Amino acid sequence: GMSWIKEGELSLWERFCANIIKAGPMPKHIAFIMDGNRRYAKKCQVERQEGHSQGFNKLAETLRWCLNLGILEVTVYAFSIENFKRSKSEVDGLMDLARQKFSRLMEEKEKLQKHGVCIRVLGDLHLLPLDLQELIAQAVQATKNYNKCFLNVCFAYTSRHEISNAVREMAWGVEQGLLDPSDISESLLDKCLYTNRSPHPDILIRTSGEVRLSDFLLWQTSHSCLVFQPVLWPEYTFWNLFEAILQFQMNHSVLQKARDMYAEERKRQQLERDQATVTEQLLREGLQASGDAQLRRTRLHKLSARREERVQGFLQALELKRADWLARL
Amino acid sequence: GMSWIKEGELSLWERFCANIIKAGPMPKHIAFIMDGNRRYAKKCQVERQEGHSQGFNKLAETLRWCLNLGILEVTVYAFSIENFKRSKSEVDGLMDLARQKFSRLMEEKEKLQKHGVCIRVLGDLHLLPLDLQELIAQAVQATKNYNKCFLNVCFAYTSRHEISNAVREMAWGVEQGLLDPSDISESLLDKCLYTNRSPHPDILIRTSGEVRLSDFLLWQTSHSCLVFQPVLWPEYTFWNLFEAILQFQMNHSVLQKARDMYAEERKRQQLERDQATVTEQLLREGLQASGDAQLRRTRLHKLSARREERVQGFLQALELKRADWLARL
Amino acid sequence: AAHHRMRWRADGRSLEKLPVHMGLVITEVEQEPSFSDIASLVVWCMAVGISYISVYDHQGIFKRNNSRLMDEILKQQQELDKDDQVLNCHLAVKVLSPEDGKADIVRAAQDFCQLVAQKQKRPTDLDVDTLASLLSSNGCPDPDLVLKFGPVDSTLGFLPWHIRLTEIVSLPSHLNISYEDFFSALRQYAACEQRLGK
Amino acid sequence: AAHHRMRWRADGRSLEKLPVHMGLVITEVEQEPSFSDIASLVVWCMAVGISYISVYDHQGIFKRNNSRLMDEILKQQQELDKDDQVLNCHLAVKVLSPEDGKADIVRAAQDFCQLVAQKQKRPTDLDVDTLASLLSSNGCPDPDLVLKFGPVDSTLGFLPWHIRLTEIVSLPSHLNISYEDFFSALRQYAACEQRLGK
């Protein structure tokens, strides 16, 4: 019923295969690099603006496929910072498309509240036209408290800009006294990305023949099933999506083993780093020579606890700063 | 058939109760402080030498009880270094008893080889008369390769002298280059005691009304069931022994829990000590900052291995020095 | 006054003998440690005239909760110049654990074997009298009496070297210990007899 | 002569383009590592003219067995002045593991946040160009091409920051890799096209 998710059920064959794969592990979060719109427009002999508009139609149809498959969170690469280097005519065309597609979202409100659709827009959003920022902000504010499904539009986004911003936020926390520099950790950087509300994608899909990530979710897709498919994005089918899920299911056991051992090893190296730090403060100022009193055990438990409360207080400030939005008004 | 273990089976009631207790944990090694011979002689109005001779009769009878109960290793306190301060007449009487009881052992050889009786005599044996040393050495040499049951006579023994000698052996190993001083450990000191061939006693029994250990197996009985019984040693009965075993069975679960946690804690503190040592050599000479290469893991595995071979080579020398016996000739 | 100090001193002086060093071995560790009972025992030894008291448990709980125990001792000692009262208990009271037994004898062996390596000492120079002076309690006598509380019939690794002649008296629990029970164990020690091998 | 050096150089020069930095991601770790196959790939890149080669596995086996791999590389490089041959491979070859990716970006964040704490730098002074120069590979280009071997469809935490534009070509196994297979992947990279957002 809405303009951002098409209304339609799976056909018999799609439903049947879906039922079969749903007997195994299913992805929770799928990320799309929607690529090939312009080649598709040239192929059909239509204007490049119609290639991109067909691209939005395929998005809405694909979110319906995910929702029918029980995949409730989707991240899409809608506009790169690098895309600002296209012609004004083409850049204008994409901003105009976003102006039209957003706001249509707003007209279709309550229908979003009915389906529980939370819409997040992630990127260095200050480079967008001011009107587009206010309209993005209104859509994000309205769907803030919805949780039946999640769509993350990466607009004016690159991964390096996202990662550089996450460091800057951690540096801001140090500058304001919320954190010590020793509090920085891989898990802390996770919580300072724009994607911090969602788990890392199970699958990265990139369409058209390109076998590169193009500055998209580099941090987040380090252990994700990577699927490169030749199809141009406006011609994406249910079966392209199905094939990608089959790829995920084939990799799942080894990819989870690797994911588990990475986390097992990262925590083990953090224990060694803190164990040596507890000894450094213990080797200094007298000698430990302990022992039954379990002094090192208490200093280590107190070390992580005081570290936990600092980062927890730091994040409440970071969300508060991110929630402060004159733009929704 | 032998003069050091009486021949006789359990009566009906002893056999019945034995069967019942053998359904639970049974001691493997019991240590006796055989005390009260002289008060017993005064009580029966016999000479003090007959009190001590009744004391040997009770030993042989008690080893038969243990053997019937399936308890195959026994350690007894036959003569303290402190006992040298008794009168010459009394000291002479005890040496003469040992001269007679040993050598009778030698006459009863082959009967020891038939029952697999290994006889060990532990103490600062150089303070004994030279003839008594040669006769002890002949008995110990003859039963060296027997293993059906074990009796350890502590003769001219104290625990402090035993512990001081164990340190001296470890110091000797350092002096000769077999060990580094950092190789000394609680487990190494265990293997340098005279009792090193036997496990630590499950029970310490002391007879007569004395509630002290009198420099006996202090290191070895740190987690042993201590049983103090008023009975004078020449009047020891099967039921005194039975009562002590019941005490052991009552303490067994908590005593093994304490024994297990002591060993769990001792090994944990040794890991911390070596972990910090591996870092000290790693913090010195560059910085570790590791890591995936598992450098600390290899240095720790190599540390204990080179420690194991040193102590293993040290002990082969210690037994060789202890086996070198002009005295058996 | 108190007064009461004189009465307790007259109790200790009336015994045939009194321990100079006493150990308190607690074999059952309670969930919330009963410091008050432990502190009462310590204060009674001090009031009757015992110079050194060692508190021990196999799991090292009292060593981990040392300041809560000293606080309870000094609170109970006021009833019946805090710095003088504090150091007087730091010098008479030690809180021990397994590491103070076998691990300390191993520490003394390493240090002496370190001197054999530096040619400063010979293995033969380590008699039992030398080893005794190298332990942590070099300037404090061996325990004369040990009060062992609880259901375990073991010293549980307490000072194995020092208890060669210690009298070991057992009481089923420390949990509501009374002065009469504590002093009854003192009468048992006073009547003990040590012949020293003779 | 060899000679063969000229033939391999003519192969690299014939391609429309060649990687300056290439990564080798091994997603399946063999029981006894196949250093010879890995060493052959490294030597081929050097012979055809690739300046930097990074070897990677998620479990850090090649980093733990670094000298066995460099030995095999230099052995295979002799066929088809050892100090000059050694340092030439120490400078062109790096053996990487997961810690060289996300853990290194965290290291750069700690050091910069250490300067914000010392008032030597401001958070706003950290643009994407500054962060790039603060990483471990500050003086070495980003990988142009990654050859990924084995059955896993993931980069497994390899240099997440540096692979923003890396072409990723997949081969099912490195286990008996041939020059023709390796050079076929080079033809794929040569034909790749990067429009840089335009």
Ligand SMILES: CC(C)=CCC/C(C)=C/CC/C(C)=C\CC/C(C)=C/CSP(=O)(O)OP(=O)(O)O
């Ligand atoms: C944010 C925005 C613009 C619109 C909002 C609505 C929305 C999320 C639409 C989906 C985003 C769509 C349709 C396209 C993504 C923009 C884009 C240039 C993708 C690469 S296709 P290329 O042009 O590169 O084609 P070739 O590779 O063939 O050259």
Ligand SMILES: CC(C)=CCC/C(C)=C/CC/C(C)=C\CC/C(C)=C/CSP(=O)(O)OP(=O)(O)O
């Ligand atoms: C080694 C040797 C001597 C003989 C070899 C045979 C042998 C092992 C015999 C068993 C050892 C025997 C019988 C007695 C142990 C010697 C002794 C003085 C024990 C304390 S009884 P105390 O005299 O103290 O009696 P109270 O306390 O009433 O004064």
Ligand SMILES: [Mg+2]
């Ligand atoms: Mg494109």
Ligand SMILES: [Mg+2]
């Ligand atoms: Mg006696």
